[PDB]
A paper describes a structure:
For PaRuvB-dsDNA complex model building, we determined a 2.1-Å crystal structure of PaRuvB in complex with ADP. Despite that, structural comparisons showed that the overall conformations of RuvB3 and RuvB4 are close to the crystal structure of ADP-bound [name], implying that these two DNA-free subunits are probably in ADP-bound state.
Residue numbers in the entry: 22 to 140, 146 to 338
Write the structure that this text describes.
């Protein structure tokens, strides 16, 4: 009863990514080689970890999962690399958070299948072929050397509402739930472009339907459930609305720099930049400028506020 895709045939709504990865995986298997190192980037919840695990599943190999911050010293990486079997996937989430010195170990491992680490003497060791799968919230914060060493680069974008409905409908089928097409669309419309949120919202709407309705997912059941969850009709939660209202109230709409906003919210810089902003920017509620972030007129309109008429 698991809803996370395990094979590439169940990876809905990124047709270019799936058609490309199907091809490169089939070719690499055909040669009995490891897949070329693969970089997957885009906002969180889009399916980067999911895709990393599908790669290992379709290649028929093991995946060791790790993260940038988990690797404090070069030897932390070296121990993972020397425990890999030939063809295994080494998945490094948040790969941009590798310290500059730990990332230096990665260049010859990826390029030459060799480990070159200091201990002061340098030691050089042969590594078996393997696939480094890196993921990051967007590729621009990688160094040129690391970025250029990936042979395959996949870009994940926010999903459109029709593909989210398809994912919601498929998950409701796997969960054994009756769902009307308009119920799938109501969740999809308010799921913030993300399959992770759409699936989580489906699980909570199912609870509402089972305790308060008749067990099946309808548009009205979905709406009431999402209202109870405090997710509005654009998919904004309490933090999204607080971000916009802080910019409007405390900063007159902006421009406001990212440090000022993080302080005024008591959130970290990276959660604004990576978790909150990218959907709000894609949908036209916030703009970046060299002087800072500004809200657009659509942020005012969304809350039923008068649009200010001033000068910049
Ligand atoms: N293409 C897709 N089709 C269906 N479900 C997906 C897809 N991509 C991701 N998911 C779902 O989204 C959720 C989170 O995905 P994840 O791989 O953790 O995203 P990321 O690592 O990019 O934050 C999982 O429950 C998975 O079921």
């Amino acid at each position: 009863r698991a809803i996370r895709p395990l094979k590439l045939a169940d990876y809905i709504g990124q047709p270019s990514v799936r058609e490309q990865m199907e091809l490169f995986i089939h070719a690499a298997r055909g040669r009995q080689e490891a897949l070329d190192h693969t970089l997957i980037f885009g906002p969180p919840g889009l399916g980067k970890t999911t895709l990393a695990n599908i790669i290992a599943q379709e290649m028929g190999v093991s995946i060791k999962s790790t993260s940038g911050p988990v690797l404090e010293r070069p030897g932390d990486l070296a121990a993972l690399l020397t425990n890999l079997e030939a063809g295994d996937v080494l998945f490094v989430d948040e790969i941009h958070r590798l310290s500059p010195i730990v990332e230096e170990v990665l260049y010859p491992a990826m390029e030459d299948f060799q480990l070159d680490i200091m201990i002061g003497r340098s030691i050089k060791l042969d590594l078996p072929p393997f696939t480094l799968v890196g993921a990051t919230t967007r590729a621009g914060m990688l160094t040129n050397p690391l970025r250029d060493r990936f042979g395959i680069v996949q870009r994940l974008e926010f999903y459109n509402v029709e593909d989210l409905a398809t994912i919601v409908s498929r998950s409701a089928g796997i969960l054994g739930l009756e769902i009307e097409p308009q119920g799938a669309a109501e969740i999809a419309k308010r799921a913030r472009g993300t399959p992770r949120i759409a699936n989580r919202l489906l699980r909570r709407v199912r609870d509402f339907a089972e305790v308060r309705g008749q067990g099946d997912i309808t548009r009205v059941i979905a709406d009431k459930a999402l209202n109870l969850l405090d997710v509005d009709e654009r998919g904004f939660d309490h933090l999204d609305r607080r971000l916009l209202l802080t910019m409007i109230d405390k900063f007159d709409g902006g421009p406001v720099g990212i440090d000022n906003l993080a302080a005024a919210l008591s959130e970290e810089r990276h959660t604004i930049e990576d978790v909150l902003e990218p959907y709000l920017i894609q949908q036209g509620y916030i703009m970046r400028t060299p002087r800072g972030r500004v809200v657009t007129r659509h942020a005012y309109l969304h809350f039923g506020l008068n649009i200010p008429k001033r000068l910049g």
